[PDB]
Design a binder for this molecule. Structure first.
Ligand SMILES: NC(=O)c1csc([C@@H]2O[C@H](COP(=O)(O)CP(=O)(O)OC[C@H]3O[C@@H](n4cnc5c(N)ncnc54)[C@H](O)[C@@H]3O)[C@@H](O)[C@H]2O)n1
Lengths: 823, 207
């Protein structure tokens, strides 16, 4: 249905009537098909900026009698349902957690034949760890009838085992402080159906119909429609034993009043028994309409089943009647989602889903918009209310109430409703609703917390990293399409904050990602959409770093082609502390050289003298590499500065070891000799000098390379935890810590995994832990290999030689002599 | 066409495309077979190389009062090499490598190639060069070869009229994309290119 901004806002005020949920289902189990049905049923539409669909708004109204069946405070017969989108596979770990983190309820889809699959089982563990209440739906029932041609009782027994399986998981992993969260078909928390044909039902639905034909309050009617309840057709009495006095068998109420009607329609229609079909239909009061009356076979069955038991309604019913509103769930989920004090003013404001308290909005992710390469922050208001214009404290990952690091006191340009693909501006938005923000893309990479309380901690952060540690080179298979790749790449980088496209000096097109999978997906999206041209992609490669271990053996000198200009310098190490401080915005290129000097001097033991002479950082003018101007009385020096800095950007972007970036490299210009006339000290003359002097300096400062390393967190049942360690000892992994969830047998292993050792890691972890393990890895740190990158046979030199040959460079690493003055 | 055969030749920062030593040997043999002779190397930026090889050396609006105006080359690739690079950075700041070009002329112009010990800038030079070529500068259908500067390497100046009668082809000598500004490493010159690189013997006495 369509709605005005007022209706949505008004509807959004009655949080008690909102449902923040996700759909936990394997892709091959109609996750897509069932979700669609709700959209085609209760999808909300508004009465030119498009976005990547991250959530869907669903409206549902119920009878005043129904609103009473809700064992949680409500108000009104209207209900707003936020269907928060989920990943397709599980490998997307980080973003699975993301969707879950903002949901309170979860519609879990299971298969009739296959039951609960390993994957769905895992996600559920995760959902339970977030204290998400589940509601089940056994899908693909049709497959059981048409294919297996199973009996009413065999099918019933199956649902029974299936439901039994789920609850083994639910009870084993649901938090004790939640109470019995198991699903019970008799209680209307388990629907059965077919996404394909578009039908589904709940015991409570058949209980509402047979409601009076027996003179029963549906409470006891639906209680009978499941389990061991029997209605003797002869005696017309209800019994609790599967046999009558003579020992004859009695059909179960479920098989009798639910499965039988359905099974008849299938038998009648699929056997084209035209005499029966009409009679059978009128009995269940199913009226065909015109063109429908002539249908037969599946075509027909499909229409009848949809009109009989509309799938979407069965689900909407369980969603509204059993899933927790933003009010019920936050009370027991708040503490879990606040790395601050339990009693804290904000944590309490979260428990009470209080719209008057300081803002506590969660940004689960940044989503691509059509409005430039801008990204809108997607999230949930856990406390207070967000308003367009309102100025907010944007607390990123590193933030801590103590320091001011990673803070961005900015103003929210616009607040919008994430109506699937389109957005709809709204003044404010009270706690409890999923909303989108406009104008934060440049302060929040992907995740973050927005607040108003100056003493507000961040909410359970979702570790991620924008550090390109895996990259590939993309080439077009048909030279003509080249311009189509040049646009798709621009496009690609425009759709993901953590994907990177850039060009090497060799002129190659580079696509670098956060990890193997993340890169892999980007390459598909490129060749299939952003470009759609047959591309030649090189094998995945790890991003390294070139760095120095000591001060240059001796001064490095280089002179321009003129032979009229000279640069004398020395390279030396930057302490990981400083490199980190640079990488973390503490030491900043945009700072007042003086204020920044004070910081480097005081907190990092730098001569304030040197620090005030920082000429530039690099690469990209902000990297953890510096050039310090230590010259003394060099006339015209400032007239070559822009060139020096330029040379430095290139020397640091692709260093002399094997073209990899430099890191933690300090360059001190000891001296310079320039031609009196500027005509002879231009860019073409100084740039190569400096770049070469630097290479010389660097190569003389005892060279070494750093390999990127992950911090992988793994969830796994104490049983399969063995397979983790099994795989880590074959990947040079280093276990950081292993913990267990108090109640459950769910361990949580954390380790360091060399990125160049993580290829096909998940694949191997899969087999190793029976698929029960839930991997999750982020870039953690750079590790300086000990080996000599110059020695071919050494471990590093082995990396280097391969790389060099791969790049078609001269196998051997240039001596410093090659970049020094040829004297 | 004087490029020998085998697919289009282009100039890259990664190297000259479709230009192997074997091809160069062929192109060179065929150039001699049509009476042309190698006179030197010319180093420059890619766009320039492209132009020279597929359009021809063209003086293009010169300072007509410039008496040493002409196309400069060098018998020693090492000296030519020093100019095989951008002379000014692109807007972002990159100075990429250039390319070495081999310059040939119709053998019929050899009669106009003269040499001198004098260094071309020096006051005497002008008058002594004009003495050798038999007419006031600028050089026309003639060329002068002499030290780039006292004790430097020798450079050769083909007058413009003569320059436009050259035929230029790529060298198998590669520029280095990872040491732009460095000096030509002698071991990078293919032995087979050296074989076909002798210079003609230039007159020292006017005709
Ligand atoms: N480049 C060399 O190989 C070489 C050898 S010695 C030498 C030095 O060059 C100095 C003079 O330099 P300059 O810049 O004034 C020479 P000039 O100013 O004429 O340079 C012109 C540039 O235009 C380039 N170009 C692009 N297209 C064409 C074309 N179609 N035809 C001809 N040239 C083209 C030339 O290669 C050269 O790079 C001399 O004093 C000498 O010491 N250069």
């Amino acid at each position: 249905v369509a709605f005005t901004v007022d209706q949505m806002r008004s509807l959004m005020d009655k949080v008690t009537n909102v449902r923040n949920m996700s759909v936990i289902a394997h892709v091959d189990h109609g996750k897509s098909t069932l979700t669609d049905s709700l959209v085609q049923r209760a999808g909300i539409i508004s009465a030119g900026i498009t976005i990547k669909s991250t959530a869907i708004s669903l409206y549902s109204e119920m009878s005043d009698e129904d609103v009473k069946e809700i064992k949680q405070k409500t108000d009104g017969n209207s209900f707003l349902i936020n269907l928060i989108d989920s990943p397709g596979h599980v490998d997307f770990s980080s973003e699975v957690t993301a969707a879950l983190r903002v949901t309170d309820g979860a519609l879990v889809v299971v298969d009739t034949i296959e039951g609960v699959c390993v994957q769905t089982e895992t996600v559920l563990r995760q959902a339970l760890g977030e204290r998400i209440k589940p509601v089940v739906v056994i899908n693909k029932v049709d497959r059981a009838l048409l294919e297996l041609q199973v009996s009413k009782e065999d099918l019933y027994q199956t649902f029974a085992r299936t439901v039994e399986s789920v609850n083994v998981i639910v009870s084993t992993y649901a938090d004790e402080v939640l109470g019995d969260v198991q699903v019970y078909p008799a209680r209307g928390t388990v629907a059965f159906g077919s996404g394909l044909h578009g039908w589904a039902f709940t015991i409570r639905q058949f209980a509402t119909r047979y409601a009076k034909k027996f003179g029963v309050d549906k409470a006891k009617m639906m209680d009978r429609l499941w389990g061991d309840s029997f209605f003797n057709p002869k005696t017309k009495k209800w019994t609790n034993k599967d046999t009558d006095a003579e020992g004859k068998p009695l059909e179960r109420a479920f098989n009798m009043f639910i499965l039988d009607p359905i099974f008849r329609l299938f038998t009648a229609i699929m056997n084209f028994k035209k005499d029966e079909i009409p009679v059978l239909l009128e009995k269940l009061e199913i009226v065909l309409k015109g063109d429908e009356k002539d249908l037969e076979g599946k075509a027909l069955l499909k229409v009848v089943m949809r009109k009989f038991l509309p799938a979407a309604d069965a689900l909407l019913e369980m969603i509204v009647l059993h899933l927790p509103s933003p009010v019920t769930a936050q009370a027991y989920r708040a503490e879990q989602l606040y790395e601050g004090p339990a009693d804290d003013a904000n944590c309490i404001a979260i428990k009470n889903c209080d719209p008057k308290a300081d803002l506590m909005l969660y940004v689960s992710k940044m989503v691509p918009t059509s409005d430039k390469g801008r990204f809108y922050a997607f999230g949930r208001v856990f406390a207070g209310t967000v308003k367009s214009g309102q100025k907010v404290r944007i607390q990123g990952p590193n933030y801590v109430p103590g320091k001011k690091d990673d803070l961005f006191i900015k103003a929210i340009q616009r607040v919008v409703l994430m109506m699937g693909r389109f957005v709809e501006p709204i003044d404010d938005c009270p706690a409890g609703n999923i909303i989108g923000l406009v104008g934060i893309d440049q302060f929040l990479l992907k995740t973050g917390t927005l607040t108003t309380s100056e003493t507000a901690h961040n909410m359970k952060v979702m570790k991620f990293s924008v550090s390109p540690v895996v990259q590939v080179a993309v080439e077009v298979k048909n030279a003509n399409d080249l311009p189509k790749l040049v646009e798709g790449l621009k496009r690609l980088s425009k759709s993901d904050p953590c994907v990177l496209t850039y060009m090497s000096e060799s002129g190659e097109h580079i696509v670098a990602g956060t990890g193997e999978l993340h890169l892999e997906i980007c390459l598909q999206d490129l060749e299939h959409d952003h470009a759609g041209v047959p591309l030649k992609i090189s094998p995945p490669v790890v991003a390294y770093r070139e760095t120095v271990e000591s001060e240059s053996s001796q001064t490095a000198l280089s002179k321009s082609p003129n032979k009229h200009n000279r640069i004398y310098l020395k390279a030396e190490p930057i302490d990981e502390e400083v490199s980190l401080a640079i990488e973390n915005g503490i030491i900043n290129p945009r700072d007042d050289f003086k204020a920044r000097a004070r910081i480097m001097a005081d907190d990092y033991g730098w001569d304030v003298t040197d620090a005030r002479k920082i000429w530039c950082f690099g690469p990209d003018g902000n990297g953890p590499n510096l050039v310090i101007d230590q010259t003394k009385a060099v006339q015209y020096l400032h007239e070559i500065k822009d060139s020096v800095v330029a040379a430095f950007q290139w020397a640091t972007k692709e260093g002399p070891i094997f073209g990899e970036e430099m890191r933690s490299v300090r360059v001190n210009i000891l001296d310079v000799t320039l031609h009196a006339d500027a005509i002879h000290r231009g860019g073409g003359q100084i740039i190569p000098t400096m770049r070469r002097a630097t290479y010389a300096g660097f190569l003389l400062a005892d060279p070494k390379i750093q390999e990127p390393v992950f911090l992988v967190e793994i969830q796994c049942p104490e049983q399969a935890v063995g397979g983790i360690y099994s795989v880590l000892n074959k990947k040079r992994g280093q276990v950081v810590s292993e913990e267990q969830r108090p109640g459950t047998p769910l361990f949580t292993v954390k380790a360091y995994l060399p990125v160049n050792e993580s290829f096909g890691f998940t694949g191997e972890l899969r087999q190793a832990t029976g698929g029960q393990a839930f991997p999750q890895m982020v870039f953690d740190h750079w590790s300086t290999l000990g080996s000599d990158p110059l020695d071919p046979t050494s471990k590093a030199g082995e990396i280097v030689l391969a790389a060099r040959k791969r790049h078609g460079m001269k196998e051997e690493v240039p001596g410093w002599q090659e970049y020094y003055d040829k004297l | 066409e004087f490029l020998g055969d085998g697919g289009d030749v282009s100039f890259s920062t990664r190297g000259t495309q479709n230009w192997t030593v074997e091809r160069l040997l062929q192109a060179h043999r065929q150039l001699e077979e049509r009476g042309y002779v190698f006179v030197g190397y010319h180093g420059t930026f890619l766009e320039a190389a492209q132009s020279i090889v597929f359009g021809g050396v063209r003086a293009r609006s010169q300072d007509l009062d410039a008496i040493w105006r002409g196309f400069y080359i060098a018998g020693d690739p090492a000296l030519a090499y020093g100019y095989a690079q951008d002379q000014e950075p692109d807007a972002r700041g990159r100075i990429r490598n250039g390319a070495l070009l081999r310059v040939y002329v119709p053998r019929s112009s050899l009669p106009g190639f003269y040499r001198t010990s004098l260094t071309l800038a020096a006051p005497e030079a002008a008058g002594e060069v004009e003495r050798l070529i038999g007419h006031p500068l600028p050089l026309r259908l003639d060329a002068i070869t002499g030290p780039e500067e006292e004790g430097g390497r020798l450079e050769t100046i083909l007058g413009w009229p003569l320059a436009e009668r050259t035929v230029v082809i790529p060298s198998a000598i590669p520029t280095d994309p990872r040491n732009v500004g460095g000096d030509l490493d002698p071991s990078s010159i293919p032995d087979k290119e050296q074989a076909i690189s002798a210079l003609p013997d230039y007159a020292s006495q006017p005709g």
